[PDB]
Scaffold this active site. Structure first.
Site, PDB file in Angstrom:
ATOM      1  N   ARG A  56      -6.802  -5.349  39.655  1.00 31.84           N
ATOM      2  CA  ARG A  56      -7.721  -6.368  39.150  1.00 31.84           C
ATOM      3  C   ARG A  56      -7.413  -7.686  39.845  1.00 31.84           C
ATOM      4  NH1 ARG A  56      -7.082  -6.593  33.195  1.00 31.84           N
ATOM      5  NH2 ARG A  56      -8.385  -4.704  33.255  1.00 31.84           N
ATOM      6  N   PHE A  61      -8.486 -17.032  39.350  1.00 26.09           N
ATOM      7  CA  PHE A  61      -7.687 -16.763  38.164  1.00 26.09           C
ATOM      8  C   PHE A  61      -6.372 -16.074  38.500  1.00 26.09           C
ATOM      9  CE2 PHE A  61     -12.006 -17.147  36.438  1.00 26.09           C
ATOM     10  CZ  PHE A  61     -11.786 -18.058  35.426  1.00 26.09           C
ATOM     11  N   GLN A  64      -3.660  -9.002  39.398  1.00 23.23           N
ATOM     12  CA  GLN A  64      -2.909  -8.199  38.441  1.00 23.23           C
ATOM     13  C   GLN A  64      -2.633  -6.812  39.016  1.00 23.23           C
ATOM     14  OE1 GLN A  64      -4.727  -8.011  34.579  1.00 23.23           O
ATOM     15  NE2 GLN A  64      -3.547  -6.223  33.904  1.00 23.23           N
ATOM     16  N   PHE A 114       0.945 -10.226  36.444  1.00 24.10           N
ATOM     17  CA  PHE A 114      -0.086 -10.915  37.203  1.00 24.10           C
ATOM     18  C   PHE A 114       0.496 -12.138  37.886  1.00 24.10           C
ATOM     19  CE2 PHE A 114      -1.194 -14.407  34.218  1.00 24.10           C
ATOM     20  CZ  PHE A 114      -0.593 -13.935  33.064  1.00 24.10           C
ATOM     21  N   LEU A 123      -3.272 -18.802  28.458  1.00 17.02           N
ATOM     22  CA  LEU A 123      -2.379 -17.658  28.318  1.00 17.02           C
ATOM     23  C   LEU A 123      -0.998 -18.042  27.798  1.00 17.02           C
ATOM     24  CD1 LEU A 123      -3.347 -15.836  31.615  1.00 17.02           C
ATOM     25  CD2 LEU A 123      -4.266 -15.412  29.339  1.00 17.02           C
TER      26      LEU A 123
HETATM   27 CL   LIG Z   1      -6.685 -12.335  28.721  1.00 18.07          CL
END
Ligand SMILES: [Cl-]
Ligand SMILES: Nc1nc2c(ncn2[C@@H]2O[C@H](COP(=O)(O)OP(=O)(O)NP(=O)(O)O)[C@@H](O)[C@H]2O)c(=O)[nH]1
Ligand SMILES: [Mg+2]
Lengths: 166, 170
Positions: A56, A61, A64, A114, A123
């Protein structure tokens, strides 16, 4: 560092070498989580990151990866068992290069992780930050370009080799 | 005739939102779990003799990005609210999705269908009567589905279109 281990990933794009990313692992502040990542990077327990995929990648962003058990983004395991607890939330997602644990809710750390490519402050307090890119942020930026809005990658991005540096 | 409907599929993680959508769009069942971030599909169908284009937004079973999830809901015309018949938590989450839909659409009358998925499995924890009773209290249809066997898949989406058409008549 005199205290924090350094590990490396050699990244491949459809099997072709892209470049090396190295990470400082914050064993001084997050020892159990840093040790898990270190050991999974050397493979010394008999399993680990070598060969696994960055499944991903979402530009702006994060990238991962780390599922070496199911090989599909749902799996992973730690050196402590399938899962381990959130060690602490001392460190925050402050910007590009931060290395943090993926999870499926509280106390579900395994092997997935990640790499932030931006500040991801929402986060904080939900994912355990435990390291940072040392060298090769340009390689992470190169990986980010193979991603898409929904995280699917246009070519397969893998950890072709990994280990610990002196 | 031809019309177009924006359908949004919502519900807790792993209930089968994507499997239901992929059965409708691609006519196959995906046994592997590939978690969604966001996916969109388009399909031309004929429902009650009236041709229409379905724009389907397949959303993630997320609880953290509710603010981001609000834009999805604003433009959606009807909502498939999915739980799995072997996941009581996913059923307990339904009222949260309905409260969210009502808040974003600013209405107590929003086209929606309650879908109880995975009816092929032998591990049921949610009784059909419990789901029928909830759907009745909302005034919405309830459809049992299996993305694996394709049971109820067309019925769920087509019923949602009927609900939108009924709402537009008011
Ligand atoms: Cl998330
Ligand atoms: N037996 C059975 N399995 C199903 C059914 N629908 C989905 N599954 C399985 O349940 C898992 C999750 O399905 P999926 O459609 O990805 O769920 P989701 O609601 O889209 N999850 P997310 O919110 O993460 O995107 C998959 O392994 C899938 O094969 C069904 O009707 N029957
Ligand atoms: Mg999905």
């Amino acid at each position: 560092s005199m205290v924090n281990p350094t590990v490396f990933f050699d990244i491949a794009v459809d099997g072709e070498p892209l470049g090396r990313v190295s990470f400082e692992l914050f064993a001084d502040k997050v020892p159990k989580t840093a040790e898990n990542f270190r050991a999974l990077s050397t493979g010394e327990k008999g399993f680990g990151y070598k060969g696994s995929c960055f499944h991903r990648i979402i530009p702006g962003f994060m990238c991962q990866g780390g599922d070496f058990t199911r090989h599909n983004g749902t799996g992973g395991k730690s050196i402590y068992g399938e899962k381990f607890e959130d060690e602490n939330f001392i460190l925050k997602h402050t910007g590009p290069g931060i290395l943090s644990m993926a999870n499926a809710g509280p106390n579900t750390n395994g092997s997935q992780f990640f790499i932030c490519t931006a500040k991801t402050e929402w986060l904080d307090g939900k994912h355990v930050v435990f390291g940072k890119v040392k060298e090769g942020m340009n390689i992470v930026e190169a990986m980010e370009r193979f991603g898409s809005r929904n995280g699917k990658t246009s070519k397969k991005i893998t950890i072709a080799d990994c280990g610990q540096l002196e | 005739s031809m019309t177009e409907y924006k359908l949004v599929v919502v519900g807790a993680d792993g209930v089968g939102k994507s499997a239901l959508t992929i059965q409708l769009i691609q006519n196959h069942f995906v046994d592997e779990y590939d978690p969604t971030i966001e996916d969109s599909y388009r399909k031309q169908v004929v429902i009650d003799g009236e041709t229409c284009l379905l724009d389907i937004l397949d959303t993630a079973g997320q609880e953290e990005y509710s603010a981001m999830r609000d834009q999805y809901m604003r433009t959606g015309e009807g909502f498939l609210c999915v739980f799995a018949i072997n996941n009581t938590k996913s059923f307990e989450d339904i009222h949260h999705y309905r409260e969210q839909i009502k808040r974003v659409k600013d209405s107590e009358d929003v086209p929606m269908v309650l879908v109880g998925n995975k009816c092929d499995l032998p591990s049921r924890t949610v009784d059909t009567k419990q789901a029928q009773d909830l759907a009745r209290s909302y005034g919405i249809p309830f459809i049992e589905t299996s993305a694996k066997t394709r049971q109820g898949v067309d019925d769920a989406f087509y019923t949602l279109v009927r609900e939108i058409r009924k709402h537009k008549e008011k």
